[PDB]
Design an enzyme around this catalytic site. Sequence first.
Site, PDB file in Angstrom:
ATOM      1  N   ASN A   1     -38.993  14.809  37.528  1.00 29.90           N
ATOM      2  CA  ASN A   1     -39.004  14.771  39.005  1.00 29.90           C
ATOM      3  C   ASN A   1     -37.677  14.275  39.559  1.00 29.90           C
ATOM      4  OD1 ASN A   1     -41.648  15.727  39.395  1.00 29.90           O
ATOM      5  ND2 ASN A   1     -42.478  13.748  38.749  1.00 29.90           N
TER       6      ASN A   1
ATOM      7  N   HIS B   1     -28.804   3.796  31.756  1.00 28.55           N
ATOM      8  CA  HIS B   1     -29.196   4.107  33.131  1.00 28.55           C
ATOM      9  C   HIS B   1     -28.473   5.325  33.706  1.00 28.55           C
ATOM     10  CE1 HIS B   1     -31.128   2.995  36.930  1.00 28.55           C
ATOM     11  NE2 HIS B   1     -30.032   3.508  37.486  1.00 28.55           N
TER      12      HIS B   1
ATOM     13  N   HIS C   1     -36.508  10.020  33.645  1.00 27.46           N
ATOM     14  CA  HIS C   1     -37.684   9.884  32.794  1.00 27.46           C
ATOM     15  C   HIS C   1     -38.325  11.243  32.639  1.00 27.46           C
ATOM     16  CE1 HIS C   1     -38.921   8.428  36.855  1.00 27.46           C
ATOM     17  NE2 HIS C   1     -40.145   8.864  36.639  1.00 27.46           N
TER      18      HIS C   1
ATOM     19  N   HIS D   1     -34.450   6.202  37.454  1.00 29.54           N
ATOM     20  CA  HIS D   1     -33.875   6.138  36.114  1.00 29.54           C
ATOM     21  C   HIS D   1     -34.523   7.357  35.463  1.00 29.54           C
ATOM     22  CE1 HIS D   1     -32.760   3.641  32.330  1.00 29.54           C
ATOM     23  NE2 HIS D   1     -33.278   4.778  31.876  1.00 29.54           N
TER      24      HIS D   1
ATOM     25  N   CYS E   1     -33.823  -2.491  37.885  1.00 32.58           N
ATOM     26  CA  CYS E   1     -34.489  -1.218  37.477  1.00 32.58           C
ATOM     27  C   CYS E   1     -35.614  -1.457  36.478  1.00 32.58           C
ATOM     28  CB  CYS E   1     -33.457  -0.285  36.867  1.00 32.58           C
ATOM     29  SG  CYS E   1     -34.136   1.231  36.163  1.00 32.58           S
TER      30      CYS E   1
HETATM   31 ZN   LIG Z   1     -32.437   1.943  34.709  1.00 23.97          ZN
END
Ligand SMILES: [Zn+2]
Lengths: 109, 109
Positions: free
Chosen positions: A82, A43, A95, A93, A1
């Site tokens: 989103n 995460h 954001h 992840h 990630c």
């Molecule tokens: Zn992540």
Amino acid sequence: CIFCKIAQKQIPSTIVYEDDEIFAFKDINPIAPIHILVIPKQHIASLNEITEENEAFIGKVLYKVSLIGKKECPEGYRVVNNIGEDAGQTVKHIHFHILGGKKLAWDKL
Amino acid sequence: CIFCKIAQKQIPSTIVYEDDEIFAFKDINPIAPIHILVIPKQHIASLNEITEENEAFIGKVLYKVSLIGKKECPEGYRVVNNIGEDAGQTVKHIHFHILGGKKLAWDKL
Ligand SMILES: [Zn+2]
Ligand SMILES: [Zn+2]
């Protein structure tokens, strides 16, 4: 990630703010003159992974988003998240985008 | 406050979902084919009024936003919150936008 790696400074970024829980950095393809990404260091894939058990933590993340926004964008700011394909989510992840620095458009999507 | 009045059904709206804490209704000037506004029934002016004392409640609101979004927009959705003048905030009662129903634009603001 890619976002876990950015949060742990394994991939370089321009850091705006960092603490034990969150990491905030400049978006390298900005759509506004101030465009900051804020991520939990933990995460969590998307907003669809919020549960009753982590909703207090996501509230804390949103509070810290507001602290960054009011400091960086005293004239006002927009927060965007989103989820999934129709929204264009590129990294799985969670954001938050903080957008500001001008009178922002509100156009047909 | 127009949003307190909508939440208490004093001003008509097309209701998507309602519970003891939140009220969700269709935006009458939509920018996407699915465009839903989600408000706490309690009056909080903007995200800049989130405190450590109400961050767990705002996390719960964001969880309920995600439940509405994943039901109404199984293909993905965008959540937007506007704070202050540069973001175009028109009503000073915190409101989350859920946008979906198509592949949404990501354009310069
Ligand atoms: Zn992540
Ligand atoms: Zn109100």
